[PDB]
């Protein structure tokens, strides 16, 4: 198969985002951002999580925002490239609210998409992910994209496209994930990476009644084979970047405190499935976390699925 390659212009924007945001410590942290549902307006916070996983130490050096850092961000751009290929093979791709599909995107669209993806969690000021923090952090990343794009990307984006792509990043309360294919692929690429930090419930069964899991969603969109190949690809990227690779064990699904019909639905779509985990690796975590060089070196080392191809012209 062919390799997944990111445009060199895109990698330059990645260096800017790493330097000005992803490398920076989180600021909505400390005693003023603790939370208790029993005394909820007691500090600045409106929910839990502000003080979680702010940094980890590797050989005495702190890697800030390890759950939402350079490795996470980079990985998302690999996934959109892969989902673009899968969508062009599909006899009838998912039709978004504007009437367009991922298969209607151009290579130039994918370049623009990849630039916006760089900023998707760049606005975060902690691991807080309840409604208000999520929306503020997305708003901040959208404005960081805008400010950079007006200064350096006006040869690539019109003022209209800057506001459209800022919108996709912002993800307003009133907006659906599939308003446009540009927006949908950004959301889906982000979705795939959640396997790094979510339990089997969210990944296979759906986090609440009515919600599809992450992996069932990929199967409904790309079919069972490509859906599972995307999953295994993401897991390959986790290993290359030193993430803990989760175990998969469908025999445990009925024992996780979830409604049995949520379990039957997952077994009928996914099938029985058992895959070993792998412990995190501190050296690969640092190589992927501390430079675009290191991270891109790791990501391009992973083989792509056998069906991956790109149009060269």
């Amino acid at each position: 198969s062919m390799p997944i390659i990111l445009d060199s212009d895109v990698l330059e924007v990645a260096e800017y985002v790493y330097k000005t945001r992803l490398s920076q410590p989180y600021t909505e942290v400390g005693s003023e951002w603790e939370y208790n549902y029993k005394n909820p307006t007691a500090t600045f916070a409106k929910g839990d999580g502000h003080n979680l996983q702010r940094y980890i130490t590797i050989d005495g050096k702190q890697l800030h925002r390890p759950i939402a850092g350079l490795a996470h961000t980079m990985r998302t751009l690999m996934y959109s490239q892969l989902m673009y290929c899968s969508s062009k093979k599909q006899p009838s791709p998912h039709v978004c609210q504007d009437g367009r599909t991922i298969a209607d995107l151009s290579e130039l669209d994918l370049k623009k998409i990849n630039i916006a993806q760089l900023f998707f969690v760049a606005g975060r000021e902690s691991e807080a992910s309840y409604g208000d923090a999520y929306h503020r952090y997305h708003l901040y990343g959208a404005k960081q994209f805008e400010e950079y794009a007006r200064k350096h990307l006006t040869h690539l984006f019109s003022e209209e496209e800057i506001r459209l792509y800022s919108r996709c990043i912002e993800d307003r309360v009133g907006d659906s994930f599939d308003g446009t294919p540009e927006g949908y692929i950004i959301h889906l690429s982000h979705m795939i990476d959640l396997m790094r930090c979510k339990s089997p419930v969210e990944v296979f069964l759906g986090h609440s009644k009515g919600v599809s899991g992450i992996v069932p969603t990929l199967i409904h969109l790309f079919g069972k084979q490509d859906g599972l190949d995307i999953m295994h690809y993401a897991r390959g990227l986790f290993a290359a970047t030193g993430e803990a690779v989760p175990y998969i064990d469908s025999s445990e699904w009925p024992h996780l405190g979830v409604d049995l019909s949520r379990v039957q639905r997952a077994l009928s779509i996914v099938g029985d499935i058992n895959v070993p985990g792998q412990e995190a690796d501190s050296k690969k975590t640092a190589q992927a976390g501390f430079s675009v060089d290191g991270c891109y070196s790791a990501l391009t080392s992973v083989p792509t699925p056998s069906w991956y191809e790109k149009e060269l012209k």
Binding site: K38, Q53, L63, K198, S199, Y247, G257, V258, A280
Partner: protein, 76 residues
């Protein structure tokens, strides 16, 4: 009662707990037993991330239930 806490890679422990225990207290018990600071413990049950001020019974966590612990890097 006894509950299980499992990392995403499958490393398992038990805890002895009560249904009224707060999640803050549970993270203290994990810190005692495994050395992991409470601020590196992202805990999840039945698809939901757990808050510190709620209790085990608030999430309907019962004897022999399994909590998932998202640990990024042991030693980090």
């Amino acid at each position: 009662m006894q509950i299980f806490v499992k990392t995403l890679t499958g490393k398992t422990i038990t805890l002895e707990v009560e249904p009224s225990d707060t999640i803050e207290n549970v993270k203290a018990k994990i810190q005692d037993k495994e050395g992991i600071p409470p601020d590196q413990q992202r805990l999840i049950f039945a698809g939901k991330q757990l808050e510190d001020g709620r209790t085990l019974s608030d999430y309907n966590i019962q004897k022999e239930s399994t909590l998932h612990l998202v640990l990024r890097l042991r030693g980090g």
